[PDB]
Design a protein around this ligand. Structure first.
Ligand code: ATP
Ligand code: ADP
Ligand code: ADP
Ligand code: K
Ligand code: K
Ligand code: MG
Ligand code: MG
Lengths: 734, 248
């Protein structure tokens, strides 16, 4: 039906633009830039202009938070189209701010909020419409009080907008439009989508679970390092679904004697029961319910048991979802993670560069920036930053922007024009990057890598084999069932140092857009020296929760070398950490699409048990890079560096016969550093590109890292493992 | 504007010397050793001689703790210049110590505190000026009670300074001038500068964070081995910014 649509979140941040689809417009006969009168629930309605985009489905309309709240509806609700009958332009339109959103800032609101928002933008306005505008490092809401030319109008440049004063009191059943929402979360698409899925039916459709009886998820546990926005995500979900958000703070619960703690837990659960669909959020769950063995007080044990029995009592269809955030997935009572109490677990995790960019764009939307703030350069060099680190960085830059113009124009309830006249310059961000101190620097990176097959030259057979083991079971799961045969879940790269094993693993992960986890030799040696091989389990857990994933074990022979050679020190090839890796590999399913890649420069000293079937059964030799791979190395290292066009990198890759990838990396690490040095000397004497002479000067110090004997040994190993037997003449008779 | 400056900490420990910059003096037409009448907040004012130094910026004036407290202002505040119209020398100038800063030490204060401080040093004096002097392994404050030749004067060698007795009670809204400050901290430039940065906007500009909404630092943790003056540094920052220091 043309008068029945479903609400979705708007991609853009436009105040009064709704996105639809061309097939929907086909049955509506509407233009690209016309206006319609959308009628919402509770008799309310608004006027908005439509837009065309292909992201939404045929019968889905995208609306932003402010227009969605104007219609008194939420995501997924039913909204008609009802095109507006072309109401003429407005004349006076009186608008006033809301008292709560204007408190603290006073002055003339025309040149700062009203005029820039209404400049060169014909935005429809109704009597009951309230609109939010971002400026002066704030988000302020304005409500229209009256409109002389009919209740509907369209803002014209000559319209004399009036703002007398006396801000209106906040209404009864209208919520703040800038507190929390899905658009306040940065790049948590997978996790936020998971939470939306688990939470949609229990809360948006409560009577369904009083009439069907299927058990919905009752306990969701958000876990991840601190500062990743778990509380923010829970608040956003509760606000968007409209369910009553009850917040339980771990420290606040545990700061109240030995009485009121239990009373407060019980009262929170009863209040959530008495108040319709609700989300109970228990922030810092490990403060309330840690491992009951490590507790050394009776009241703590009673707190944990009371939480357990409250969670068990929330097995009925009371429409109360209990959410909990912890930084300790393994330091909360295991009895909480059982079925019926906290069944679902969501790992928030570190934001990637895209997520960091999204968070930075969210935190800087109200702030007036400059033109030089890239906001993507910082997002690429904020490694190890959780969203809280990024918020701290943004606030630090903004504060230093205020620390440069601090007492020039006095900020004595201060005027709006001076507030709007601020700017943050990119060098402030580059300053804060050196004063950042990321919290999650020492955290396992789980991200789809940016290495593609372009960054790798040659290795055509290796690329083919890798995509046979990874790309086929992922992108063609129809096979491996028709033929009834599981994909191999592991491969062992072997070859000389510096030949692209890491890049091959990253590129195969990126081709399937799979997560990539790298476990380097120092980490295996850390587990071996400290006898903390139990952490191997955790690594595989991270791989399983991040599926599809490539779990890469670089220099898998590190422990074997640390023990000596092939024998080692008296003992055999088995060690505790590689034994744990074997155990964890046997415990995977091949249906998780977790692929293990081990790399070793010394396949001779590797434990043979890891080469057995059901393990890294395929061995791939990664040889010394051929000339095409050398050209790729040179191009990849030289990209991001201004290099002269006359350099014959193809020629450069011809006498680098037995050179490894690290050899050419050092070749530019020297030529390009000579260029830097020449720049500095010429700048000293005076006060653009890596020339051919720089590359000749660097090649004058070119040495092969891997000797001929080592290459001979690698070739011998490859022969004895790949030359097979004399079965090349086999043929079925007739 | 010639009548709008920003306060900074004084490099030297001189009691009544303020440091400025030559470009600032260019628009003021003042000599190297002349006197000016600096007017502070809350209607208070004092008289002081200026000095030239290149460390401060063009529009920054350096003042020490005692003269800054005489103007009822703190670091970074707005102070005008208003050069003094060359008031003649004083005649009697009666000064008396404050009761709290003199308790425990008694006797004649002329040869120990007054005369050495006023010997070969023409220091301007106002009626409301209170000045601190270091001697006898102590730091003692003296407040002027009266001045016969106009409220402003300049101390002359032949001036008969009078100290009768009866020390004045400590006033209501005036703090002790020798408790804690930035000049009581030794060689913590980096750390003290960091703390000043994080603390300046939240405390000196409170209404800014009721009108902008950017999150300022709410928790600062000073850590280091014992005896490094963390409590001293915190007390100094609180005293200099004027915010209420609550000690737990
Ligand atoms: N085939 C290749 N394609 C792209 N880059 C390569 C290739 N071979 C080597 N390199 C270059 O080698 C450098 C790093 O080598 P890499 O980490 O892949 O080696 P490796 O085979 O894992 O050996 P090692 O264990 O000795 O570090 C990078 O500069 C990379 O560009
Ligand atoms: N994913 C995110 N997107 C946007 N902002 C974030 C994100 N994560 C953290 N922040 C910022 O960090 C601040 C604190 O995050 P917080 O909710 O305490 O983390 P957690 O929920 O993991 O304890 C929030 O005010 C928010 O502004
Ligand atoms: N950096 C410093 N500058 C000047 N005096 C100091 C300094 N550090 C310590 N002191 C002297 O040491 C005494 C005790 O220092 P204290 O404040 O207890 O150290 P902390 O603050 O680290 O506990 C103070 O009375 C002070 O006189
Ligand atoms: K929060
Ligand atoms: K102390
Ligand atoms: Mg939390
Ligand atoms: Mg490797």
């Amino acid at each position: 039906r043309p008068n029945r649509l479903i609400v979705d979140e708007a991609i853009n941040e436009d105040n009064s633009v709704v996105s639809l689809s061309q097939p929907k417009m086909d049955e509506l006969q509407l233009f690209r830039g016309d206006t319609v009168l959308l009628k919402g629930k509770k008799r309310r309605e608004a006027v908005c202009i439509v837009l065309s985009d292909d992201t939404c489905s045929d019968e889905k309309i995208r609306m932003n938070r402010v227009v969605r709240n104007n219609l008194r509806v939420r995501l997924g609700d039913v909204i008609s189209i009802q095109p507006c009958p072309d109401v003429k332009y407005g004349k006076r339109i009186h608008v006033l701010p809301i008292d709560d959103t204007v408190e603290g800032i006073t002055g003339n609101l025309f040149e700062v909020y009203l005029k820039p928002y209404f400049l060169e933008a014909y935005r429809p306005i109704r009597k009951g419409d309230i609109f939010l505008v971002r400026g002066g490092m704030r988000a302020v809401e304005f409500k229209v009080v009256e409109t002389d030319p009919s209740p509907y109008c369209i803002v014209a440049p000559d319209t004399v907008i009036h703002c007398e004063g006396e801000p209106i009191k906040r209404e009864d059943e209208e919520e703040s439009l800038n507190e929390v929402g899905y658009d306040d979360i940065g790049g948590c698409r997978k996790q936020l989508a998971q939470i939306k899925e688990m939470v949609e039916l229990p809360l948006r459709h409560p009577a369904l679970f009083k009439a069907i009886g299927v058990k919905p998820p009752r306990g969701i546990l958000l876990y991840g390092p601190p500062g990743t926005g778990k509380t923010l995500i829970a608040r956003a979900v509760a606000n968007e679904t409209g369910a009553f958000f009850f917040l339980i703070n771990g420290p606040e619960i545990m700061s109240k004697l030995a009485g009121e703690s239990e009373s407060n837990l019980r009262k929170a659960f009863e209040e959530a029961e008495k108040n319709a669909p609700a989300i109970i959020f228990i922030d810092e769950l490990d403060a309330i319910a840690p491992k009951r063995e490590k507790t050394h007080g009776e009241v703590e044990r009673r707190i944990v048991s009371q939480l357990l029995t409250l969670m068990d009592g929330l097995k009925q269809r009371a429409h109360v979802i209990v959410m909990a955030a912890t930084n300790r997935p393994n330091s909360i009572d295991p009895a909480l993670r059982r079925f019926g109490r906290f069944d679902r677990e969501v790992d928030i995790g570190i934001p990637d560069a895209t997520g960091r960019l999204e968070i930075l764009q969210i935190h800087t939307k109200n702030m007036k920036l400059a033109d030089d703030v890239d906001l993507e350069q910082v997002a690429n060099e904020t490694h190890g930053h959780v969203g809280a680190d990024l918020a701290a960085l943004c606030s630090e830059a903004a504060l230093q922007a205020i620390r440069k113009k601090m007492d020039l124009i006095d900020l004595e309830t201060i005027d709006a024009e001076v507030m709007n006249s601020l700017a943050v310059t990119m060098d402030d961000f580059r300053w804060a990057l050196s004063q950042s101190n990321p919290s999650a620097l020492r955290e396992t990176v789980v991200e789809v890598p940016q290495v593609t097959w372009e960054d790798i030259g040659g290795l055509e057979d290796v690329k083919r084999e890798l995509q046979e083991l990874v790309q086929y079971p992922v992108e063609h799961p129809d096979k491996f069932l028709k033929f009834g045969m599981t994909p191999s879940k592991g491969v062992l790269f072997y070859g000389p140092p510096g030949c692209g094993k890491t890049l091959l693993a990253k590129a195969i992960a990126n081709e399937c857009q799979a997560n990539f986890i790298s476990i380097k030799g120092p980490e295996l040696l850390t587990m071996w020296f400290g006898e903390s091989e139990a952490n191997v389990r955790e690594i595989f857990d991270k791989a399983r929760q991040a599926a599809p994933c490539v779990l890469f074990f670089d220099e898998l022979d590190s422990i074997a070398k640390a023990r000596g050679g092939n024998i080692g020190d008296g003992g055999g090839a088995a060690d505790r950490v590689i034994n744990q890796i074997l155990t964890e590999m046997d415990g995977m399913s091949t249906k998780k699409n977790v692929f293990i890649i081990g790399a070793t420069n010394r396949p001779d000293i590797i434990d043979p048990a890891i080469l057995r079937p059901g393990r890294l059964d395929q061995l791939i030799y990664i040889p010394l890079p051929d000339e095409k791979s050398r050209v790729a190395i040179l191009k990849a290292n030289l990209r991001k560096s201004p290099v002269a066009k006359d350099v014959d990198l193809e020629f450069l890759a011809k006498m680098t016969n037995g050179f490894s990838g690290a050899d050419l990396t050092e070749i530019c690490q020297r030529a390009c550093k000579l260029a830097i040095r020449e720049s500095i000397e010429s700048e000293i004497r005076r006060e653009p590109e890596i020339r051919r002479d720089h590359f000749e000067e660097a090649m004058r110090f070119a040495r092969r890292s891997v000797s001929d004997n080592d290459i001979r040994k690698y070739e011998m190993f490859a022969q004895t493992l790949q030359q097979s037997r004399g079965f090349g003449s086999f043929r079925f008779p007739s």
